Design a protein around this motif. Structure first.
Motif, mmCIF file in Angstrom:
data_model
loop_
_atom_site.group_PDB
_atom_site.id
_atom_site.type_symbol
_atom_site.label_atom_id
_atom_site.label_comp_id
_atom_site.label_asym_id
_atom_site.label_seq_id
_atom_site.Cartn_x
_atom_site.Cartn_y
_atom_site.Cartn_z
ATOM 1 N N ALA A 187 0.853 -1.178 0.000
ATOM 2 C CA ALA A 187 0.000 0.000 0.000
ATOM 3 C C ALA A 187 0.891 1.230 0.000
ATOM 4 N N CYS A 188 0.376 2.322 -0.560
ATOM 5 C CA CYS A 188 1.153 3.556 -0.649
ATOM 6 C C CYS A 188 0.202 4.729 -0.821
ATOM 7 N N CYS A 189 0.207 5.649 0.142
ATOM 8 C CA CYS A 189 -0.620 6.846 0.106
ATOM 9 C C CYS A 189 0.269 8.080 0.135
ATOM 10 N N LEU A 190 -0.131 9.110 -0.606
ATOM 11 C CA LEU A 190 0.619 10.357 -0.697
ATOM 12 C C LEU A 190 -0.276 11.504 -0.255
ATOM 13 N N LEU A 191 0.143 12.207 0.793
ATOM 14 C CA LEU A 191 -0.609 13.322 1.362
ATOM 15 C C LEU A 191 0.191 14.599 1.126
ATOM 16 N N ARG A 221 12.332 3.923 -10.941
ATOM 17 C CA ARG A 221 12.817 3.397 -9.676
ATOM 18 C C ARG A 221 12.474 1.917 -9.555
ATOM 19 N N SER A 222 13.137 1.254 -8.608
ATOM 20 C CA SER A 222 12.895 -0.161 -8.335
ATOM 21 C C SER A 222 11.885 -0.300 -7.197
ATOM 22 N N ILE A 223 10.658 0.109 -7.494
ATOM 23 C CA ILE A 223 9.545 0.015 -6.558
ATOM 24 C C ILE A 223 8.780 -1.259 -6.888
ATOM 25 N N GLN A 224 8.796 -2.217 -5.966
ATOM 26 C CA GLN A 224 8.170 -3.516 -6.166
ATOM 27 C C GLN A 224 6.914 -3.621 -5.314
ATOM 28 N N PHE A 225 5.815 -4.033 -5.938
ATOM 29 C CA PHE A 225 4.571 -4.319 -5.246
ATOM 30 C C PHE A 225 4.317 -5.820 -5.261
ATOM 31 N N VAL A 226 3.682 -6.313 -4.196
ATOM 32 C CA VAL A 226 3.357 -7.731 -4.139
ATOM 33 C C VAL A 226 2.314 -8.066 -5.203
ATOM 34 N N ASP A 227 2.312 -9.333 -5.621
ATOM 35 C CA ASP A 227 1.462 -9.757 -6.727
ATOM 36 C C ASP A 227 -0.024 -9.656 -6.407
#
Ligand SMILES: Nc1nc2c(ncn2[C@@H]2O[C@H](COP(=O)(O)OP(=O)(O)OP(=O)(O)O)[C@@H](O)[C@H]2O)c(=O)[nH]1
Ligand SMILES: Nc1nc2c(ncn2[C@@H]2O[C@H](COP(=O)(O)OP(=O)(O)O)[C@@H](O)[C@H]2O)c(=O)[nH]1
Ligand SMILES: COc1ccc(/N=N/c2cc(OC)c(OC)c(OC)c2)cc1O
Ligand SMILES: [Ca+2]
Ligand SMILES: [Mg+2]
Lengths: 426, 437, 155
Positions: free
Chosen positions: B314-318, B339-345
């Motif tokens: 999860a990722c939220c930007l305020l 960037r090397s931003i990895q999210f789970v499948d």
């Protein structure tokens, strides 16, 4: 945690206890009369920890004076600060002890213990938030060691949740060549392991070596030795008496310095070493961990530190203290246990004692303290093997089995220091 | 409007809560005496800031906060500070003898003597709320009260407020400004007993904040004052959605929906940017893409860990300030493949964005400079297990020798609780490993 | 029994009682249940005058008890410098060994009687004498960190 009830028993306890009040009263701005003459506001912030508050802005030290020798009370009254003590806190008997631990603990001392407890309750009720008790005594005599430990067990029953702190003076033939002192010392350690929370080991053997060799004094006296004791007791209690960062809590000190209940015997240190008639931050941290600056005749490089507390005093760079201390921990990493992370705490206070501008008080729980207990045990066994003067104790109603148990309990204490000295984490 | 009650436990919780409520009043325009000139509705209202502030008949705005500590030294400064006129006097609860850095003293012995009085004072605040949604608990991990008493408090609030949410702002211990050597013990003991009762916890690594004050603020020897001012700046960015209008994390329930995929892994990572020293008042205003680039840098994070070593769930930007939405969309588009931003499948690879067009408010005497735009990223990454691993290692070093354990056994606690708490921490590290780190 | 009255007289230090008893045929070399002679108790309690009177009336200066303790062992242990010289004057074995392997030099070193250590060395005290644990007088000084004693043993 707030007020502390001071107790001094015996000739040594009242002597080193009198010098303790003459030093801190000068640091807090208190005259022998009691009228506050300090020139800074910080001298009265935590003044209620060691002093009461009599009518007329008078500060009365929360100290209790006890001794079986009736002549010691006149030795304290005739002192400079001997007028500020509460006359109701003088509890002196008629028959002394004659350096007999049995008379102080079973016969002559058991008659005087109830008179002392009455004034302990009288002081403990005038406190808003009593935290613990403080006792000064020697372990070689009969009153301060025989009755001193008895007074501890009595207070331990009525104040079990309070902290018991002692300043015990260890005997040494270089200062007093009395062959019955290893007896009284060993019997006292048998009681201190069980009924005290934190004990400061002040060794006359180390005090003599500092005066005779470091200070170049061919014949050190009790005044020269107590000068190192008064400066030590002032440093270990700097946070308890002055405003700073430390909470000034006896229990917080015991939790952070006593990893095992039986290993609560501290090795105090002080720097710089000066005499009665007469440095940078990297020099204070260096001298602090030097064996020549220890108030106990033990080489810290022969053991491993369990916990360490260093109190710096004076105007010094807050950042530099964190640098030199962190650097000393690296150069001597083989002398700190690896299974206690962050076992060195650093405290710094802004009000140094008089005569100096900077100072450092070392409080270390080191396994090397076994060398002190080995010295007393070897002298005890030598006398006990021949049973010399053993009738001086059995004649006062003591059982001979109490010697073997004290010898066995003290040998177990040494083996416990060696156990955690050779332990590893892996 | 749904009210939120804040709870401040121990020295760390009280001092940080003092700096937060100061910043809340400056953001909302509330004077230190509880007066708010821009509040035309006197005696009450339905505004967004009423979630944190109640209103009396005289127009006074009082925080919905409770301060509790087992010793009065820390709270007494709040009783005589600048905002002494702001808080209800009956919400400043103090004991006489503290927990002495013992989890057992705060949970089993000393804490029991004041637990019933604290709940009755919380009961009084709960009765004034029309739609109470939950609580915000501020406490430290290392302290005896912040760990022992907080665990006792969280267990009681679950029985009295079962449906209500509970969020934490925990202080992660750091050797640079630590107080006790047994702080690894208290942190593990309080995490085990509070894991079931907590819905979402934001951990604040004191070492991470310490380094930010040294590097970004040029403060050689940061004190608790410098740390708390920066912490309150980040706490305000997290709770801004609860106190102002918006469409992201509008209530406490949405905090769990957006950040917590599974109950046990409820420890999101917070990152804030930019952090500029007040000595640079004529600095260049960083763009939206530059401050968003600074969110995935480990040096700007509130917990020391490497998110590149883990994957995001999860990722939220305020955002706060002069922020055009098309600039955020363009930023995230670039910061998606550059960037090397990895999210789970099993998680939708996306970014939730919320924008508050008012720039952050700085406090008089602070160390931060005014910025026209800032961003606070909340992300649940498995790399935060690195902090639990550092804490569990120092725990195993001392407990293998049973060091300092007698202090806990002598205060009504059994030694068996040490093992089951450590086993629970082992099961927590496995929870992150089963997701991927 | 005048022998048991002579034991307590030497222990209590009654000089007049020691003379009257020996005049009536008291056994000067009597022993208690542990083998302690009147010379043992006299040297233990620091009664120098009784020590010299017994030595002039046929007292065995090298008598041992059940534990092998000679009068020189006890005098060096308690720390009676005057009595040690009188015993050494009348032919006391300076290197006698008790049941624990200790010599008079060992006991004076352990108890910190530096003056007695100095007298024993001048009278032929074996510095290489080991106890049942293998420690000599110099080993006691090194293990105890007694540099003052170490300098005496390095003459
Ligand atoms: N960031 C920050 N951390 C703090 C502050 N005060 C204390 N801490 C941290 O809290 C830890 C100790 O917990 P405390 O809150 O001080 O202790 P407590 O909650 O009052 O509990 P007691 O042990 O009974 O005193 C230490 O490791 C500190 O680093 C603060 O003002 N700001
Ligand atoms: N450092 C120091 N030690 C002392 C002082 N007075 C006595 N001692 C030591 O205490 C031991 C004697 O015990 P003492 O207190 O006099 O006997 P008590 O009256 O039964 O308590 C001796 O070994 C001394 O070395 C003193 O003023 N300072
Ligand atoms: C090994 O870790 C630690 C060692 C010592 C610590 N504190 N030490 C003290 C010492 C005090 O007086 C000497 C205090 O005054 C009575 C004192 O009041 C709080 C604390 C703390 C540690 O985390
Ligand atoms: Ca309103
Ligand atoms: Mg506290």
């Amino acid at each position: 945690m707030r007020e502390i009830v001071h107790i001094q028993a015996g000739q040594c306890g009242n002597q080193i206890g009198a010098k303790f009040w003459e030093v801190i009263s000068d640091e807090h701005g208190i005259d022998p009369t009691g009228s506050y003459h300090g020139d800074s506001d910080l001298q009265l912030e935590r003044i209620n920890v060691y002093y009461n508050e009599a009518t007329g802005n008078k500060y009365v030290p929360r100290a209790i004076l006890v001794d079986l020798e009736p002549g010691t009370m006149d030795s304290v009254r005739s002192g400079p600060f001997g007028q500020i003590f509460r006359p109701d806190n003088f509890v002196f008997g008629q028959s002394g002890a004659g350096n007999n631990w049995a008379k102080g603990h079973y016969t002559e001392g058991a008659e005087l213990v109830d008179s002392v407890l009455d004034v302990v309750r009288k002081e403990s009720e005038s406190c808003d938030c009593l935290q613990g008790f403080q006792l000064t005594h020697s372990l070689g005599g009969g009153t301060g060691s025989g009755m001193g430990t008895l007074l501890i067990s009595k207070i331990r029953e009525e104040y079990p949740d309070r902290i018991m702190n002692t300043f015990s003076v260890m005997p040494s033939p270089k200062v007093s060549d009395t062959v019955v002192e290893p007896y009284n010392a060993t019997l006292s350690v048998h009681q201190l392991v069980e009924n005290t929370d934190e004990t400061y080991c002040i060794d006359n053997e180390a005090l003599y070596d500092i005066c005779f060799r470091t200070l170049k004094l061919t014949t050190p006296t009790y005044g020269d030795l107590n000068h190192l004791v008064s400066a030590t007791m002032s440093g270990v209690t700097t946070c308890l008496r002055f405003p700073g960062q430390l909470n000034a809590d006896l229990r917080k000190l015991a939790v952070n310095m006593v990893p095992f209940p039986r290993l609560h015997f501290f090795m105090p240190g002080f720097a710089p070493l000066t005499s009665r008639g007469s440095l940078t931050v990297p020099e204070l941290t260096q001298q602090m961990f030097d064996s020549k600056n220890m108030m106990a005749a033990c080489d810290p490089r022969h053991g491993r530190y369990l916990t360490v507390a260093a109190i710096f005093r004076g105007r010094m760079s807050m950042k530099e203290v964190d640098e030199q201390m962190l650097n000393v921990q690296n150069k001597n990493s083989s002398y700190f246990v690896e299974w206690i992370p962050n076992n060195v705490k650093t405290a710094v206070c802004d009000i140094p004692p008089r005569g100096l501008k900077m100072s450092a008080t070392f409080i270390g729980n080191s396994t090397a303290i076994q060398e002190l207990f080995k010295r007393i045990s070897e002298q005890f066994t030598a006398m006990f093997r021949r049973k010399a003067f053993l009738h001086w104790y059995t004649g006062e109603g003591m059982d001979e089995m109490e010697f073997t148990e004290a010898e066995s309990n003290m040998n177990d204490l040494v083996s416990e220091y060696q156990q955690y000295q050779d332990a590893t984490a892996d | 409007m749904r009210e939120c009650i804040s709870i401040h436990v121990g020295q760390a919780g009280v001092q940080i809560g003092n700096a937060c409520w100061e910043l809340y009043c400056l953001e909302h325009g509330i004077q230190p005496d509880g007066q708010m000139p821009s509040d035309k509705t006197i005696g009450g209202g339905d505004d967004s800031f009423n979630t944190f502030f109640s209103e009396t008949g005289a127009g006074k705005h009082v925080p919905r906060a409770v301060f509790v500590d087992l010793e009065p030294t820390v709270i007494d400064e709040v009783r005589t500070g600048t905002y002494r006129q702001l808080f209800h006097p009956e919400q400043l609860i103090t004991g006489k003898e503290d927990a002495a850095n013992n989890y057992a003293r705060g949970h089993y012995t000393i804490g029991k003597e004041i637990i019933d009085l604290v709940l009755d004072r919380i009961r009084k605040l709960a009765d004034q709320c029309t739609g109470l949604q939950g609580f915000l608990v501020f406490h430290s991990f290392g302290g005896g009260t912040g760990s022992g008493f907080t665990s006792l408090l969280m267990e009681r609030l679950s029985v009295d407020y079962g449906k209500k949410s509970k969020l934490e702002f925990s202080i992660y211990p750091a050797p640079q400004v630590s107080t006790a050597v047994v702080e690894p013990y208290n942190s593990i003991l309080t995490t085990h007993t509070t894991l079931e009762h907590s819905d979402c916890a934001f951990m604040v690594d004191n070492e991470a904040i310490y380094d930010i004050c040294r590097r970004n603020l040029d403060i050689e020897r940061p004190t608790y004052t410098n740390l708390n001012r920066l912490i309150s700046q980040i706490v305000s960015s997290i709770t801004a959605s609860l106190r102002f209008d918006g469409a992201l994390n509008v209530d406490l329930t949405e905090f769990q929906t957006n950040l917590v995929p599974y109950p046990r892994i409820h420890f999101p990572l917070a990152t804030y940017a930019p952090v500029i020293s007040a000595e640079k008042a004529y600095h260049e205003q960083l763009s939206v893409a530059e401050i968003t680039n600074a969110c995935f840098e480990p040096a700007n994070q509130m917990v020391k860990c490497d998110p590149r070593h883990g994957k995001y769930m999860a990722c939220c930007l305020l955002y706060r300030g002069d922020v055009v939405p098309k600039d955020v969309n363009a930023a995230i588009a670039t910061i998606k493949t550059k960037r090397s931003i990895q999210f789970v499948d099993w998680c939708p690879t996306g970014f939730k964005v919320g924008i508050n067009y008012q720039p952050p408010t700085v406090v008089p005497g602070g160390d931060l400079a005014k910025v026209q735009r800032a961003v606070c990223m909340l992300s649940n990454t498995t790399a935060i297990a690195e902090a639990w691993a550092r804490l569990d290692h120092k725990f195993d070093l001392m407990y293998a020798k049973r060091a300092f354990v007698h202090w806990y056994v002598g205060e009504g606690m059994e030694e068996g609780e040490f093992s089951e708490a450590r086993e629970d921490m082992a099961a927590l590290e496995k929870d992150y490993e089963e997701v991927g780190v | 029994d005048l022998g048991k009255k002579l034991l307590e007289a030497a222990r209590a230090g009654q000089d007049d009682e020691v003379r009257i008893l020996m005049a009536n045929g008291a056994d000067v070399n009597a022993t208690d249940a542990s083998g302690l002679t009147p010379l043992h108790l006299a040297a233990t309690y620091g009664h120098l005058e009784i020590v010299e009177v017994l030595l002039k009336h046929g007292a065995d200066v090298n008598a041992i008890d059940i534990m092998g303790s000679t009068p020189l062992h006890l005098a060096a242990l308690i720390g009676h410098l005057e009595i040690v010289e009188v015993l050494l004057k009348h032919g006391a074995d300076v290197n006698a060994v008790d049941t624990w392997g200790d010599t008079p030099l060992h006991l004076a070193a352990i108890m910190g009687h530096l003056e007695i250590v100095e007298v024993l060395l001048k009278h032929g005290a074996d510095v290489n004498a080991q106890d049942k644990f293998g420690k000599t007088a110099f080993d006691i000084s090194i293990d105890n960190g007694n540099e003052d004693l170490a300098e005496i043993l390095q003459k």
